[PDB]
Amino acid sequence: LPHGHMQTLIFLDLEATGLPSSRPEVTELCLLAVHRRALENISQGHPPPVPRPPRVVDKLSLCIAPGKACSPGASEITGLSKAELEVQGRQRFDDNLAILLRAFLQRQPQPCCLVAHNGDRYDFPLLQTELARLSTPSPLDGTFCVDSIAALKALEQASRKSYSLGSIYTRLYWQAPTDSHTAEGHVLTLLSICQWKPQALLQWVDEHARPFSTVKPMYG
Amino acid sequence: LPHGHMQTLIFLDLEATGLPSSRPEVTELCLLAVHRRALEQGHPPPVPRPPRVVDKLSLCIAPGKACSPGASEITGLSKAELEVQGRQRFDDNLAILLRAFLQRQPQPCCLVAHNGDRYDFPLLQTELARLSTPSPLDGTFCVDSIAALKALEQRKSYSLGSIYTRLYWQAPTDSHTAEGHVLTLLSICQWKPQALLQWVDEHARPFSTVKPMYG
DNA sequence: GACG
DNA sequence: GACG
Ligand SMILES: [Ca+2]
Ligand SMILES: [Ca+2]
Secondary structure (H helix, E strand, O other), X not given: OOOOOOOEEEEEEEEEOXXXXXXXXXXXXXXXXXXXXXXXXXXXXXXXXXXXXOOOOEEEEEEOEOOOOOOXXXXXXHOOOHHHHHHOOOOEOOHHHHHHHHHHHHOOOOOEEEEEOOOOOOHHHHHHHHHHOOOOOOOOOOOEEEEHHHHHHHHHOOOXXXXXXXXXXXXXXXXXXXXXXXXXXXXXXXXHHHHOOHHHHHHHHHHHOEEHHHOOOOOO | OOOOOOOEEEEEEEEEOOOHHHOOOEEEEEEEEEEHXXXXXXXXXXXXXXXXXXXXXXXXXXXXXXXXXXXXXXXXXXXXXXXXXXXXXXXXXXXXXXXXXXXXXXXXXXXXXXXXXXXXXXXXXXXXXXXXXXXXXXXXXXXXXXXXXXXXXXXXXXXXXHXXXXXXXXXXXXXXXXXXXXXXXXXXXXXXXXXXXXXXHHHOEEHHHOOOOOO
C-alpha cells in the first residue's frame, strides 16, 4: 500500500473553457466525497440496474468565472459561457475558493483520494494550474489522486471498447448517462461506474493512489 | 424595499434528529445558491428547469444524539451510521466551510427555507450558537417560502409536497434527502419567479434576529 | 399549521 | 485516446 488505506473517495469533475492545448480555465467544479464503506455497502436484474448512490455523501458544486472566453465546443458541451457566468455574478477561481475546498476536504476521513475520468491528463493537471495562480498554499498537498480510466480498464479486463465516461457507462448499464452538461452530472455518472465493482475498485485505488502534489501543472 | 434587492437566493434544507419539541440536531444540510438574474405556462406548467448556473453544498453531519425512530425512517440517516462513515459534528471547520461558500455569493444574500421561520432558521441558529467562532450568517437575510406562496397563489395545505403537486400535478422527486427537499423548494419558487423575487426583497429580514430553537 |  |  503506497500510502495506506484511503477512507474517502472524492469523485471530481471540472468543466472548462476548452481542451488542454488551449490553456483552459475552470468554469465549474464538482466534488462528491464518499467514505469507502458507503462504496462497499449485489446487483440484480437485466440489464444490470444503475446502482443507488450511497445515502451518506458530501457534495460541492461551484460555478466559476474564467478569465478568458469559453471555446465554442466547451460552451456547447457545458451550457456555460463566460458572459453568463459574469451576468449571474460568478467569481474567478480565487483564494476563498481554495479555503472552501480546504474546509470541505478537512471534513472527510483521512486519507482522501480524488478520482476523475482522464484525471491524470485533464482534471488533476488543470486543477494544479488553477491553484498555482493563487497566493495561498495548495489544499491538496496531502490529498491523493488516481485516474478512473486506468481503473476500469484494469477492472473489466479482470472480467475494442472506448473508455470515455459515457461509453463505459452504457457498456455497464445499457442506459445513456442522465446528465452530460454539468460537473455534477459527470460526477454522478463517474460514481455509478465506480459502483460497478466497488470492492475491486477500492483495492485498485488503495494501491495506485499517488500524491496530488506530484501532478504536474497543465500550463505555467 | 427594506434591505434593497437580494442578489442571491440560497435555498436551504435541514435534516435532523426530530421535530422541534425533541430539541433536534442537524444531520444533513443542503444549500443551493441562485443569482437573482437566474430567476428574473400553462395549465399545468411543466416543472421549471433548475437554472444552469448554481452553487450547491450538501453535507452529512454527525449529531450529538440519536435520531428519533421517525426521523431515521424518513431521512435514511442514523447517528450510528453517520459515525460509521466518519462524519464530523456541526463544528468550527463547518462554519469556515459555510462562510466561504456564502462569500462566493453576491451580497446581499437571502436564505429561503420552507417553514424555515418555525424550523430551519431557528434550528440553524441553535446549531451555530453552539460554536466558538462568530456566526458566518450574521450578515445574511432570510425568508420563509410558506408565506411567499400563500401570497403568490392568487384553505389547502402549504406543506412542501402539497404546493408542488397542486402546481405541477406531480409528486416531488425526492422526499428523503436534504438535496431532494431543496430541489422541490426550488421548483416551487420558480413557478412565479418575478413575483417570488418581489416578495423576497420586501420581506427579507436579518438572520441575526432569528431566535434559537432552544438552548 | 408544519418542520424531522 | 480522452478531457472541454
Ligand atoms: Ca471530465
Ligand atoms: Ca424541510
